[PDB]
Design an enzyme around this catalytic site. Sequence first.
Site, PDB file in Angstrom:
ATOM      1  N   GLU A 122      -6.100 -11.016  -0.806  1.00 64.14           N
ATOM      2  CA  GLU A 122      -6.980 -10.700   0.319  1.00 64.14           C
ATOM      3  C   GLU A 122      -8.464 -10.664  -0.072  1.00 64.14           C
ATOM      4  O   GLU A 122      -9.240  -9.817   0.379  1.00 64.14           O
ATOM      5  CB  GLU A 122      -6.604  -9.371   0.966  1.00 64.14           C
ATOM      6  CG  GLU A 122      -5.077  -9.159   1.215  1.00 64.14           C
ATOM      7  CD  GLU A 122      -4.756  -7.931   2.048  1.00 64.14           C
ATOM      8  OE1 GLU A 122      -5.689  -7.225   2.502  1.00 64.14           O
ATOM      9  OE2 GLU A 122      -3.541  -7.635   2.226  1.00 64.14           O
TER      10      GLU A 122
ATOM     11  N   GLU B  51       0.797  -1.231   0.000  1.00 64.72           N
ATOM     12  CA  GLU B  51       0.000   0.000   0.000  1.00 64.72           C
ATOM     13  C   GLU B  51       0.829   1.281   0.000  1.00 64.72           C
ATOM     14  O   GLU B  51       0.513   2.196   0.775  1.00 64.72           O
ATOM     15  CB  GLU B  51      -0.943   0.011   1.224  1.00 64.72           C
ATOM     16  CG  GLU B  51      -1.959  -1.144   1.214  1.00 64.72           C
ATOM     17  CD  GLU B  51      -2.879  -1.171   2.428  1.00 64.72           C
ATOM     18  OE1 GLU B  51      -2.872  -0.189   3.219  1.00 64.72           O
ATOM     19  OE2 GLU B  51      -3.645  -2.154   2.568  1.00 64.72           O
TER      20      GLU B  51
ATOM     21  N   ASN C 198       2.007  -5.264  -2.988  1.00 58.69           N
ATOM     22  CA  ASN C 198       0.597  -5.613  -2.680  1.00 58.69           C
ATOM     23  C   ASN C 198      -0.227  -4.330  -2.456  1.00 58.69           C
ATOM     24  O   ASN C 198       0.221  -3.393  -1.793  1.00 58.69           O
ATOM     25  CB  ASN C 198       0.569  -6.519  -1.415  1.00 58.69           C
ATOM     26  CG  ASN C 198      -0.785  -7.128  -1.134  1.00 58.69           C
ATOM     27  OD1 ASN C 198      -1.389  -7.755  -2.021  1.00 58.69           O
ATOM     28  ND2 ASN C 198      -1.291  -6.942   0.114  1.00 58.69           N
TER      29      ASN C 198
ATOM     30  N   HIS D 159     -10.353  -6.468  -2.428  1.00 57.76           N
ATOM     31  CA  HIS D 159     -11.460  -6.209  -1.515  1.00 57.76           C
ATOM     32  C   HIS D 159     -12.555  -5.558  -2.344  1.00 57.76           C
ATOM     33  O   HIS D 159     -12.588  -4.341  -2.499  1.00 57.76           O
ATOM     34  CB  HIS D 159     -10.979  -5.305  -0.379  1.00 57.76           C
ATOM     35  CG  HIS D 159      -9.972  -5.974   0.513  1.00 57.76           C
ATOM     36  ND1 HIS D 159     -10.298  -7.059   1.298  1.00 57.76           N
ATOM     37  CD2 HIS D 159      -8.668  -5.695   0.766  1.00 57.76           C
ATOM     38  CE1 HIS D 159      -9.238  -7.426   2.002  1.00 57.76           C
ATOM     39  NE2 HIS D 159      -8.227  -6.618   1.693  1.00 57.76           N
TER      40      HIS D 159
ATOM     41  N   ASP E 101     -12.219 -10.575  -0.583  1.00 61.02           N
ATOM     42  CA  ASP E 101     -13.519 -10.745   0.073  1.00 61.02           C
ATOM     43  C   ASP E 101     -14.560  -9.962  -0.718  1.00 61.02           C
ATOM     44  O   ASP E 101     -14.209  -9.164  -1.611  1.00 61.02           O
ATOM     45  CB  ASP E 101     -13.482 -10.433   1.592  1.00 61.02           C
ATOM     46  CG  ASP E 101     -12.775  -9.109   1.921  1.00 61.02           C
ATOM     47  OD1 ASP E 101     -12.712  -8.209   1.039  1.00 61.02           O
ATOM     48  OD2 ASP E 101     -12.232  -8.921   3.022  1.00 61.02           O
TER      49      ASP E 101
END
Length: 482
Positions: A373, A261, A308, A344, A375
Amino acid sequence: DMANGWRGNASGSTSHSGITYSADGVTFAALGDGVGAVFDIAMVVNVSAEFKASEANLQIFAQLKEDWSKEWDCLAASSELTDLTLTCTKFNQTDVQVGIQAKGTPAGTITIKSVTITAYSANVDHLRDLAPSDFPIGVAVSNTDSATYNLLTNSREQAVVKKHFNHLTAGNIMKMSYMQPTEGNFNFTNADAFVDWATENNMTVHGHALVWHSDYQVPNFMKNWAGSAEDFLAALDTHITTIVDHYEAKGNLVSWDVVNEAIDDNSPANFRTTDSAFYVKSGNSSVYIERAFQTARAADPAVILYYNDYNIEQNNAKTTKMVDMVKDFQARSIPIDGVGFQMHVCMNYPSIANISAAMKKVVDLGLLVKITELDVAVNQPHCDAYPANKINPLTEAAQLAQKKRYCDVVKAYLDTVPVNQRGGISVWGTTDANTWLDGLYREQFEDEKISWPLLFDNNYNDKPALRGFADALIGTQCTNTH
Ligand code: NA
Ligand code: NA
């Protein structure tokens, strides 16, 4: 509801005398056999001394209204009584009369204090075994950072993880201040215990994360750095070298989020400045990014190095800056092996066309593409005009929309990323009972757990989400239907 809807009832010949409303609930005089109290569609009760003395039993019962003869089975005997708890368990039709009545030769009174009244399978044996090529099917776990959900103390977490996955990421304990809380004092105990369990269970580990600006896990000595820029950068090197070297020697740690990030959320996008201790303490410079990659590569030349990030799947400004960074690194021989798309996502945003285009930009630069990650939020304050269309409680329609969405994303990954560039797909958690999203959006969610974004529910049972993920792996048409 113990303050509205209650009635006296007589199932026998003796008349009832209605009910009394009090602060205690609903009381009736147990005047004779079959005298009771009912309401319309597990109890707590307190019986009088004259009731216990009477030797009369209590019968919870239910009956269809006007078709009166159709649940006689329930019975609480006198000997079971002395504030008690009484439970009772053709039932489904398209008006139900429920209550409790005295049985025998009763006397005295009955006070009712409360009344409350209360399984999908994806048919997937082992999600990991459906992958059409050998790429990781992974999950984030809790460790010592969660007393409740710690993988190593929670047998339900262990069971679901063993059943479906073959690759693991630590949710928090491999972050910076968890690995080096104070300068020179590295803490490998808990993360080594985690890696050992992965090894015992034939699962590899993705390390998360060597460098990340998020304040709660920046080591205090770094946050508060008061030395020169070069000595700060030398400290960052020591952090990375010590950890990478250690996990190289441990075995089973196959890839790292080297930098997490580093790009801002603006349009156009730039590397983070004032909100990153790394930029500020390096002397207002983003040289720490390339340096972290170089340092990690030197420490273990075989471990796979990822950059990432979130929102880089949207295919807009953040994607562009990420691609420009990758191209710059390639042009300048800065080592980088792959890009991690946290993924996400919302139910309907971003589009599959955009997610696919964003991944393909990384494919075409010859690097690995890893979903790190994943979801899929059912409610998310930045999507579907929240809260205008808020879904609460969770519905079957939303669970089926989520099945289709998981399927669409996994399919996009497979359609876009060639076999030998597949770094893996991991989901950010096991059970909906412990998703990071509910804490992240707690204000917007008014403290309710309403993101329901994962493959298993609060009881660790399958959701249609799991079926959608499997459907993509097996090349079955993605649908929002059973
Ligand atoms: Na594996
Ligand atoms: Na080494």
